[PDB]
A paper describes a structure:
Kod-RI is an engineered TNA polymerase that was evolved from a replicative B-family DNA polymerase isolated from the archaeal hyperthermophilic species Thermococcus kodakarensis (Kod). The polymerase harbors the A485R and E664I mutations required for TNA synthesis on DNA templates, as well as the 3′,5′-exonuclease silencing mutations (D141A, E143A) that prevent the removal of newly added TNA residues. Phosphonomethylthreosyl nucleic acid (pTNA, also abbreviated PMT and tPhoNA) is considered a possible XNA candidate for information storage in cellular systems. pTNA is an unusual example of an XNA; it contains modifications in both the sugar and phosphodiester moieties with α-l-threofuranosyl sugars connected by 3′→2′ phosphonomethyl backbone linkages. X-ray crystal structures of the post-catalytic complex showing Kod-RI bound to a DNA substrate that had been extended with either two pTNA adenosine residues (ptA) or two 2′-deoxyadenosine residues (dA) were solved to high resolution.
Our findings indicate that Kod-RI is capable of synthesizing trace amounts of full-length pTNA after 24 h of incubation at 55°C. The nucleotide addition products reside in the enzyme active site of Kod-RI as canonical Watson–Crick base pairs with their complementary thymine bases on the DNA template. Close inspection of the newly added residues failed to identify any differences in the hydrogen bonding pattern of the Watson–Crick base pair even though pTNA does not form a stable duplex with DNA in solution. No signs of duplex destabilization were observed in the pTNA structure, indicating that Kod-RI likely forces pTNA–DNA hybridization by acting as a large molecular clamp to hold the complementary pTNA and DNA strands together. In the Kod-RI structure of the pTNA extended primer, we observe a novel alternative conformation for R606 (labeled R606B) that is not present in the Kod-RI structures solved for the DNA or TNA extended primers. Located on β26 of the thumb subdomain, the positively charged guanidino group of R606B forms a strong ion pair interaction with the negatively charged phosphonate group connecting the newly added ptA12 and ptA13 nucleotides. Another novel interaction observed in the pTNA extended structure is a weak hydrogen bond between K592 and the O4′ atom on the sugar moiety of ptA13. In contrast, the threose ring of pTNA adopts a sugar conformation that is C3′-endo (PptA13 = 37°) and C4′-exo (PptA12 = 47°) in the enzyme active site of Kod-RI.
Numbering used by the authors: 1 to 756
Amino acid sequence: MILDTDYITEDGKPVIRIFKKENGEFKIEYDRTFEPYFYALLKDDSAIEEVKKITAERHGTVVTVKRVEKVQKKFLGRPVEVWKLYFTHPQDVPAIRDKIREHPAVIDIYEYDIPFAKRYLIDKGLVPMEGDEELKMLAFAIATLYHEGEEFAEGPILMISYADEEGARVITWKNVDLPYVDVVSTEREMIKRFLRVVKEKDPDVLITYNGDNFDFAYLKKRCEKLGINFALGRDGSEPKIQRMGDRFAVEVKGRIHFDLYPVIRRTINLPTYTLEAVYEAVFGQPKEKVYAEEITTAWETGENLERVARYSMEDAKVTYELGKEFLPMEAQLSRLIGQSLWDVSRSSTGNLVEWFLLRKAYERNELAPNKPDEKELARRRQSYEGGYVKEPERGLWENIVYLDFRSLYPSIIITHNVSPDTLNREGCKEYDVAPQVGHRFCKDFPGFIPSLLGDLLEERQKIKKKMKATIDPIERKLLDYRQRRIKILANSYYGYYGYARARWYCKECAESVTAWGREYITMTIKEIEEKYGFKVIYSDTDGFFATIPGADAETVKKKAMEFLKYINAKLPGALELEYEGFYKRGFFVTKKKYAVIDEEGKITTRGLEIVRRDWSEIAKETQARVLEALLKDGDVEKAVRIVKEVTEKLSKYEVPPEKLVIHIQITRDLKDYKATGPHVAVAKRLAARGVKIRPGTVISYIVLKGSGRIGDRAIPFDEFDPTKHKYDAEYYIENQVLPAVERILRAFGYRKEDLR
DNA sequence: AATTCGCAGTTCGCG
DNA sequence: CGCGAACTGCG
């Protein structure tokens, strides 16, 4: 199993290291034969010996073109000849590429920004995380001494906890009377003991929660103050702290540093991403938070350190359990994309698609288009029309079916062969023409993307077959993760086409996909209404809700099935309309906001305040209770009574403050805000006290009694003191609870004033 | 740093 | 000074 690749330099030459786990044994394979390269398109082929002779400077060393070679490649499906330029060292490419490009005899250069170690995985056809290897995992966490106003890591680390399959332990340098606590005499001894634990356990994976931006940088700065060689890497190196623009990321050579924090933020939608909230959401069990003020207080007084150590132990324990839950899924992502788990677990959609495509392009001798520079990025600013959204027939409906297309956009891409290499390609026998926008797509050969998509969807079906047939629980589950990752990847191609930073950006492809989607859904709506007598209540992009106004539940179901047989005989290629479900009742509030109830009483909500982090729990819970009384009991009277009891509890200050918290993400640097809403106001005051506020921070605040601007009486919920602060009961009535329920209960004649 | 589609709370500036 | 537009966030 390949874990990662990198390179080191030996006598001026790159040596690739392949880090592997084979038969339970860690191995480093060295490859001295791989040459960095990129491609150049020349106006005339005699110009090569001119550019073959260009040189650059790399702090000290002159940089030469090592050697050149003419190759035949495809570019967007058309044959092309280019010069492959080889170099001695990968750092030669950034030093020289701008000067080779600026040459008047060079039309353009290509594949000039591919990191050497990732280039190696692609060109050698190596796929990380393949095979039957069990990885040894170890989670760790730290507790630090924090004082408001101090610089980062001016205080000592107080405890280091770690956990694996054998249990969890805490190292600390004060006496704590617990069996899982190991006491050493100093902070230096604690770090050194932790280093020895990691060396002795020799894990393949180090799991942290936000270790990229807290734990390792804290450890590093203490190790600098204390004179510790923090040799965590299997090659004896220190953790390598890389700038990723906004934040940092930390590598441990020969291991996989698996930071759960970027993984969870991209995998689950939670109102906040504290370790306690993530653990409770994933496993359903509570985890108690101990705050920095309490930790520092316990350390300086020497009292109740057992509580701090138990919290520290539990941090490591739940980090391990979360690592066990999420690492297998990320390993399948790594195998599918063909890049290291470290990389893919820190990457966004656009990057992941692009790395998959670069590997496929290499496999097919397709030269990669370049990323856009500034002038092209501005040229790609234009938007295009998206999915069709019908204004709902608002209100309460009975006996509804939902019909939707199976994977509408992937079906369109495959059926109509939508790809930048087939777009208006001249000379073909056959074309499909996008409605409205008119783009033509050659059908004579499978386009690059449709071909990859079709392979993906076919592989996913084969995995589902192997899953049901396989006789192995571990294999069955890894297959499940793989088919889920394939679905996400296949569903990512449409948006990637419209992504202005994409190498294979194609706005014509993107808007042809949406145009066909609009044509299929609106034509299907027309057929069901005109030929089958349905009333379409609401429709959004790839599906619609419909009923037969005067009909009973069984009539609606059966005629829906008849329509499906009718319409699917008319739909071309991979387009397929499917029966998604029957809902006894549904309430449609606005576009993209509705709730339905199935025959077993399960309520599904979409777009409603109940799902949003920026609405208080008291409002969300009231909306939920109103929707239960309407959809399940058909009892408007009960729903109104519910609202009146909630508004009465608020005005008597009987609601727990925890149900009044509003969670809102900070999305940018605080000085970049043109306007200051309440969460920005809270964040700015926290940053004034020295608190680290970065994009992605979730501000959790409560609105206090007073008047004027909400932001002027908003405070972090952590600071809420029910003895010195009064929450704004009227604010949570008038701005939270009543707005969330009013738009539902208006359909039955009630105004806000009859609910207070 | 996937897309376009959508709703709505807060703040503020304008007649 | 009530109203709407801008800003903002998150489905």
